[PDB]
C-alpha cells in the first residue's frame, strides 16, 4: 500500500507512474513509493506517446503540456527494488549530485549501505554509511584528519563502542574534545599521549583535566606547572612538599609574595614560618 494517494495513474511497464493529490508525480516500485518529480499545478496523465519522447499531461485545458519521464532515476531505483544494487550503480554516472545521494538512500533503504556509499556524491552520506557498516577506516578518511570534528566525534564514540580504543584515541585527537579525550587517554599509566590534550587545560583553569595527565607513573611531568600557571600557587607548594625534591622553598616564596599583594596582612606571608604559611625549613618529608 503506497503512501501517496493516486489521483490518476498510468502503467509504464509494471512500474506505476501516478499523479498524487499533493501534485506529486510518483512511481510505485516494489511496493515503495518514490517521487519521480513534482508537479507545480494539478495535472492529469493523458498518456505516454513514445513519438514525442514524452508523457502528455493536460491541465483544465484540452491542450498539451509534456513531462519526459526521468528514466535514469526510475531504472536506478527499480533495479534497487529488485535487489540489483550493482545494476543500479551502472546507472549512477548519469544521476547527478544530490540525486546520487538520494538514489543511494533508496539503495540503502532497500539495503547495502556500502554500494550506496560509492554512488553518494555527498561525503556526509558516505561518512554515515561508513559508521553504519562499521568501517572505521573509511569513515576516518571521510572525516579527514584535519577538522570535521563533528564527524570525528561520531566516529570516536563508534570506535569506543567496538572497544577499538586505537581508532578512538585518533578520533578524539582530531575532534580535540579535551575533557573526553583525557578520559580515554589518562588510562595510560605512563602518560603516553595525554599531555598534549591537556596542555591548554593547565592554564585554562581546567586544572583537573591537567593534573590527571601529568601525575600517572610517579612523575611530576608538569603537575606543579599547571598549578603555577593558573595562579593556584599554594597547590604547587603543596605538591612540591609531597614528592620532596625540596623545590618548596621557591614555590612557597612566590606564593607568600602573592599573599602580600592579594591583601593579607595578618596572614601576609613574607616570613619563613611567622606569617601564616611555611616555607621549606618548616616543612618536611
Amino acid at each position: 500500500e503506497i503512501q501517496e494517494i493516486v489521483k490518476t495513474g498510468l502503467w509504464v511497464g509494471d512500474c506505476f507512474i501516478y499523479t498524487s493529490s499533493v501534485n506529486r508525480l510518483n512511481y510505485y516500485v516494489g511496493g515503495e513509493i518514490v517521487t519521480i518529480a513534482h508537479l507545480d499545478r494539478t495535472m492529469y496523465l493523458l498518456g505516454y506517446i513514445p513519438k514525442d519522447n514524452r508523457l502528455y499531461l493536460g491541465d483544465k485545458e484540452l491542450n498539451i503540456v509534456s513531462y519526459s519521464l526521468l528514466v535514469s532515476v526510475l531504472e536506478y531505483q527499480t533495479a534497487v527494488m529488485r535487489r540489483d544494487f550493482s545494476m543500479a550503480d551502472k546507472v549512477l554516472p548519469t544521476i547527478p549530485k544530490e540525486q546520487r545521494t538520494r538514489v543511494a538512500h533508496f539503495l540503502e533503504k532497500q539495503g547495502f549501505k556500502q554500494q550506496a556509499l560509492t554512488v553518494s556524491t555527498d561525503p556526509e552520506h558516505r561518512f554515515e554509511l561508513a559508521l553504519q557498516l562499521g568501517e572505521l577506516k573509511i569513515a576516518y578518511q571521510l572525516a579527514v584528519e584535519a577538522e570535521s570534528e563533528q564527524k570525528w566525534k561520531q566516529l570516536a564514540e563508534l570506535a569506543i563502542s567496538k572497544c577499538q580504543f586505537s581508532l578512538a584515541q585518533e578520533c578524539l585527537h582530531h575532534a580535540q574534545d579535551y575533557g573526553g579525550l583525557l578520559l580515554l587517554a589518562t588510562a595510560s599509566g605512563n602518560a603516553s599521549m595525554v599531555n598534549k590534550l591537556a596542555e591548554g587545560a593547565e592554564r585554562d583553569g581546567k586544572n583537573n583535566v591537567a593534573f590527571m595527565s601529568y601525575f600517572l607513573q610517579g612523575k611530576l611531568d608538569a603537575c606543579l606547572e599547571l598549578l603555577i600557571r593558573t595562579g593556584r600557587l599554594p597547590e604547587a607548594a603543596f605538591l612540591a612538599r609531597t614528592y620532596l625534591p625540596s623545590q618548596v622553598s621557591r614555590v612557597v616564596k612566590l606564593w607568600r609574595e602573592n599573599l602580600s599583594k592579594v591583601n593579607q596582612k595578618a596572614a601576609e606571608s613574607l616570613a619563613d614560618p611567622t606569617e601564616y604559611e611555611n616555607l621549606f625549613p618548616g616543612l618536611k618529608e
Binding site: Q164, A187, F211, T242, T274, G282
Partner: protein
C-alpha cells in the same frame, strides 16, 4: 582597613564580617560570615583564600559544602592526602564528574577507584584501560565481560603498561600545612 583595625570594631553585618576575614587573610571568621550570608559562593572564595594562607583542612570543609568535590579530588594528591582523596571520589562518582571521581584513582598507586566509577558510567572501555595498565587485568576483564569485550587493541596510550605511582612520600600532609599566623 586592609590590615583590619577599624574593621575589627564593626563586624556586626554578616558581609562586614566576610570582608574582614579576607583583608586579614584568616578565613576562619570568613566561613562563619560566609555561613551567615547563607551562601555557597562565599565558602568557595574563602576556601581559595584559605589555600592561600596554607592549610587545606579549612579548604576541604568549604569546598565540600560548595560541592566542589572534584576541585578537592585535584587538590588532594597535591596536598598529599590519600584518605581524604577517597572521600571526594565517591561523592563525585555520583555526580559523574569525570574530572573529579576519575582523578583519585591515578593519584593513589593503584587504579581501582576509576574502574568501578566508570563501570557505573557505563564507560567500560575507559574502565578496562585504566585497570589493565595497573596490572588489574582481572577487573579490566570484568568490565569487558559485563559489557562489549575486546581488550586486545593498543591505543595511542598504553592499555597494559604499568601504572604504579608511589603515592605521597610525606607523612604530614598539607591539610596539616604548618602555620603560626600573625
Amino acid at each position: 582597613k586592609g590590615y583590619p583595625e577599624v574593621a575589627l570594631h564593626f563586624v556586626k553585618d554578616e558581609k562586614t564580617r566576610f570582608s574582614l576575614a579576607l583583608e586579614c587573610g584568616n578565613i576562619e571568621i570568613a566561613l562563619e560570615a560566609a555561613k551567615a550570608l547563607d551562601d555557597k559562593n562565599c565558602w568557595e572564595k574563602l576556601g581559595e583564600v584559605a589555600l592561600l594562607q596554607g592549610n587545606h583542612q579549612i579548604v576541604e570543609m568549604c569546598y565540600q559544602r560548595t560541592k566542589n568535590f572534584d576541585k578537592l579530588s585535584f587538590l588532594y594528591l597535591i596536598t598529599g592526602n590519600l584518605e581524604k582523596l577517597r572521600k571526594m571520589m565517591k561523592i563525585a562518582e555520583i555526580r559523574k564528574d569525570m574530572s573529579g571521581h576519575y582523578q583519585n584513582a591515578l593519584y593513589l598507586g593503584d587504579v581501582s577507584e576509576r574502574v568501578r566509577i566508570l563501570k557505573n558510567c557505563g564507560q567500560k572501555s575507559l574502565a578496562y584501560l585504566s585497570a589493565a595498565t595497573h596490572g588489574l587485568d582481572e577487573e579490566a576483564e570484568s568490565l569487558k565481560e559485563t559489557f562489549d569485550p575486546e581488550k586486545e587493541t593498543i591505543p595511542d596510550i598504553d592499555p597494559n603498561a604499568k601504572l604504579l605511582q608511589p603515592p605521597a612520600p610525606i607523612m604530614p600532609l598539607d591539610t596539616n600545612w604548618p602555620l603560626l599566623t600573625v
